[PDB]
Design a protein around this ligand. Sequence first.
Ligand SMILES: O=c1ccn([C@@H]2O[C@H](COP(=O)(O)OP(=O)(O)O)[C@@H](O)[C@H]2O)c(=O)[nH]1
Length: 451
Amino acid sequence: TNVELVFIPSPGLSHLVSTVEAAKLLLHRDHRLSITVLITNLHKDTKVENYTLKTTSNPNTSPRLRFINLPTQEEDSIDSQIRQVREIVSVLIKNPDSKLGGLVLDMFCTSFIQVAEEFAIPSYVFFTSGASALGLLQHLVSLKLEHNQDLTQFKDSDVELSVPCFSVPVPAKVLPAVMVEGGPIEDTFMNYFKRIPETRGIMVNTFYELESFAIQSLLSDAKAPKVYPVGPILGFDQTQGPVGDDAIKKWLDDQPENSVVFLCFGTMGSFCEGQVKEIAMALEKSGNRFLWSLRNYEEVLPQGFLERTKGVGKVMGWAPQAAVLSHPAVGGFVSHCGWNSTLESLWFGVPMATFPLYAEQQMNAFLLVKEEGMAEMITLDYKIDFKGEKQPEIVGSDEIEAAIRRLMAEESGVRRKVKEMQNKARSALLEGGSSYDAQCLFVHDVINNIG
Ligand SMILES: O=c1ccn([C@@H]2O[C@H](COP(=O)(O)OP(=O)(O)O)[C@@H](O)[C@H]2O)c(=O)[nH]1
């Protein structure tokens, strides 16, 4: 009667954490369910070792959560990756005390639908982003595949698109750049997302009160896999607290409440020397207390920037993002609009200033600013990747300073919507919330679809 689920996340510590935290919640919804996560490069990344070890070694983690390593070599393309999953799956169905409920794949792991079809087990997809991204990606896929459209026509275009999962026209400049590029880049990602509608169910990392209009549009197509908004899935306990820092907590305790603006740009926010100097100049002219996570310093910052901003701000490298946003001193967040960073800032009621860089962050910035109105914008169409030997585009310090001033105001319609949306996010995870029911409905359908 026991049902085992196999999760296949994309390589990296990030996508693994969201898979583990989501698995920990689904296990609490049915004691008959077990989850086995396939790790792409366990014995190669020491950060993935620590996370997998500290999770399995913890007595509070469920005993029904197993981590199995995928011994991927260097030359294995999609050919050999399929077999090493097919090998483990064939070993896992030999257990007569468990029924394989199916494969739950990542957005970049939809190639293993082949394996699920060979073993006559269902296929599922865990979308680590929001519903507005899913509907947009399927709209762009249907445009090229079903309407015979050259998606490069929207590249650097001032036109707007009528996307079904959006209540406002979506500018072509906020589209995911990899979908309007063409050639090998577009082909790689189109083969990733076009196989999603061929699954049984799609788990989305969002809640209904956030991206309503998109979820209704995704569910309207009955000829499509049912979507389960199980978010927000965050990279900490979501009930105890994230790991912090003493010297960090020391300085923020001295500043007033909602007075420090935090600046972080994810794990790939490598600006050029010019853009960093514009951010530092804007922080100087704003006069606001700031905490800047910057990835030497006196050679990349304006002359005397640290000297003039000594008692008002602090600059550093890597930052405990979730812990900093939880501090009462942080009242602003200049973010790259990553979905995890967006959900973290929403979980702690911190309003955001959009500085999107890569991936779907351009659409996430458009979603929060124009669609929902719960974020001030610095830019919506900024792209960090400069092609050829061309000079990178740069956002001026005046545009950054203006958005910080609007963000750190005592009262604003953005700050009120964020505080209101923060409670709607925390209620969605409590029993009876929208995402709680979605988790229970998902685990219910996984067991019922097996016969
Ligand atoms: O200095 C940093 C930068 C990032 N993060 C974490 O890295 C992720 C960044 O968010 P997201 O994955 O949406 O952005 P991306 O990694 O794609 O840039 C989140 O889990 C953050 O908590 C962090 O802890 N400290």
